[PDB]
Tab-separated table of C-alpha atoms in Angstrom:
chain	number	residue	atom	x	y	z
A	1	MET	CA	-47.026	68.621	115.452
A	2	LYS	CA	-47.412	64.996	114.059
A	3	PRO	CA	-50.890	64.064	113.934
A	4	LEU	CA	-52.308	60.643	113.293
A	5	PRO	CA	-51.203	58.994	110.022
A	6	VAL	CA	-53.534	60.443	107.262
A	7	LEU	CA	-55.388	57.657	105.307
A	8	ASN	CA	-53.317	57.025	102.294
A	9	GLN	CA	-52.116	53.990	100.079
A	10	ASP	CA	-50.302	52.757	102.890
A	11	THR	CA	-52.810	53.352	105.989
A	12	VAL	CA	-54.784	50.408	107.467
A	13	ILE	CA	-57.237	50.608	110.038
A	14	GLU	CA	-58.721	47.680	112.155
A	15	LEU	CA	-61.026	48.473	115.191
A	16	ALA	CA	-62.635	45.558	117.361
A	17	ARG	CA	-64.659	45.693	120.380
A	18	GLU	CA	-64.973	42.955	122.759
A	19	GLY	CA	-65.859	42.282	126.681
A	20	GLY	CA	-69.412	41.963	128.177
A	21	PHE	CA	-69.943	38.925	130.322
A	22	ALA	CA	-70.524	36.180	127.480
A	23	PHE	CA	-68.736	35.372	124.072
A	24	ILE	CA	-71.675	36.137	121.665
A	25	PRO	CA	-70.947	37.011	117.773
A	26	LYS	CA	-73.400	39.953	118.263
A	27	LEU	CA	-70.824	41.097	120.737
A	28	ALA	CA	-68.249	41.289	117.918
A	29	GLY	CA	-68.296	44.476	116.273
A	30	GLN	CA	-65.291	44.329	114.076
A	31	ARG	CA	-64.282	46.551	111.446
A	32	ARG	CA	-60.760	45.895	109.367
A	33	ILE	CA	-60.190	48.156	106.705
A	34	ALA	CA	-57.230	47.812	104.852
A	35	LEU	CA	-56.660	50.840	102.106
A	36	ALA	CA	-53.506	48.897	100.701
A	37	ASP	CA	-55.625	46.042	99.708
A	38	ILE	CA	-57.979	48.121	97.853
A	39	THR	CA	-57.840	50.584	94.831
A	40	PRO	CA	-57.222	54.296	94.912
A	41	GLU	CA	-60.547	55.423	93.598
A	42	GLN	CA	-61.989	52.389	96.379
A	43	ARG	CA	-60.378	54.285	99.124
A	44	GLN	CA	-61.474	57.648	98.180
A	45	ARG	CA	-64.955	56.365	97.609
A	46	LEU	CA	-64.768	54.296	101.090
A	47	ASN	CA	-63.985	57.366	103.110
A	48	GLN	CA	-66.316	60.016	101.610
A	49	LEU	CA	-68.982	56.858	101.874
A	50	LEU	CA	-68.607	56.609	105.558
A	51	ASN	CA	-68.492	60.285	106.144
A	52	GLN	CA	-71.247	60.791	103.993
A	53	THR	CA	-73.298	58.839	106.376
A	54	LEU	CA	-72.434	60.599	109.549
A	55	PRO	CA	-74.616	63.322	108.770
A	56	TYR	CA	-77.044	60.879	107.343
A	57	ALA	CA	-77.153	58.367	110.216
A	58	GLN	CA	-78.353	58.390	114.026
A	59	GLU	CA	-77.001	60.423	116.796
A	60	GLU	CA	-74.182	58.630	119.156
A	61	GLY	CA	-75.010	57.927	122.801
A	62	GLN	CA	-72.150	59.585	124.625
A	63	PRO	CA	-68.925	57.917	124.571
A	64	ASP	CA	-70.019	55.540	126.786
A	65	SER	CA	-73.768	53.954	125.925
A	66	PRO	CA	-75.862	51.701	128.392
A	67	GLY	CA	-76.464	48.206	127.609
A	68	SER	CA	-75.850	44.509	128.622
A	69	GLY	CA	-72.360	43.163	129.663
A	70	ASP	CA	-70.268	43.793	132.812
A	71	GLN	CA	-66.581	44.606	131.368
A	72	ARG	CA	-66.159	46.294	127.784
A	73	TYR	CA	-63.036	47.361	125.989
A	74	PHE	CA	-62.258	48.702	122.736
A	75	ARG	CA	-59.399	47.814	120.675
A	76	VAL	CA	-57.636	50.108	118.050
A	77	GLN	CA	-55.100	48.943	115.703
A	78	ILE	CA	-53.994	51.548	113.237
A	79	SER	CA	-51.293	49.989	110.951
A	80	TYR	CA	-49.460	52.636	108.981
A	81	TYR	CA	-46.371	52.253	106.768
A	82	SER	CA	-44.429	55.232	105.517
A	83	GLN	CA	-40.760	55.906	104.591
A	84	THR	CA	-39.812	57.496	107.783
A	85	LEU	CA	-42.283	55.735	110.090
A	86	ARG	CA	-43.335	51.900	109.351
A	87	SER	CA	-44.956	50.153	112.049
A	88	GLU	CA	-48.435	49.509	113.612
A	89	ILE	CA	-50.139	50.960	116.504
A	90	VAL	CA	-52.531	49.344	118.783
A	91	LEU	CA	-54.415	50.321	121.791
A	92	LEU	CA	-56.889	49.024	124.092
A	93	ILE	CA	-58.853	50.553	126.784
A	94	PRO	CA	-62.108	49.759	128.701
A	95	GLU	CA	-65.304	51.614	127.235
A	96	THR	CA	-65.499	53.106	130.894
A	97	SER	CA	-62.564	54.956	129.744
A	98	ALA	CA	-62.839	54.901	126.185
A	99	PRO	CA	-62.032	58.462	125.043
A	100	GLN	CA	-63.654	60.570	122.128
A	101	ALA	CA	-60.951	59.047	119.741
A	102	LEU	CA	-61.913	55.527	120.529
A	103	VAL	CA	-65.546	56.091	120.149
A	104	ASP	CA	-64.841	58.250	117.319
A	105	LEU	CA	-62.444	56.025	115.796
A	106	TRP	CA	-64.724	52.822	115.873
A	107	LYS	CA	-67.706	55.234	114.212
A	108	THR	CA	-65.743	57.384	111.864
A	109	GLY	CA	-62.172	56.267	112.013
A	110	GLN	CA	-60.977	59.733	111.104
A	111	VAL	CA	-58.747	62.046	113.020
A	112	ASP	CA	-60.096	63.788	116.123
A	113	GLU	CA	-60.260	67.394	116.011
């Protein structure tokens, strides 16, 4: 088993949602976090922060919640640089098919299990 690349000093998660019908800033919802662009403490505090916010935040509205737009899609780009494996992984799939991993990656951004 080789689960997703755990958040390390060489991990970079970047997710962005687009689609709908009209190009509107509010429909951006972009989130690019690069651990390699911050300090060790900053990373740990960041992960713990967001995670600690989950139980302190509202509830999710199913893998695909209602709203405006006609064609929505999620784009998750996981950039991981290791010794044996050094590359990035981009995934783009419509919201209508957005798996729990996608909806969870944009919300928590942590390995699903």
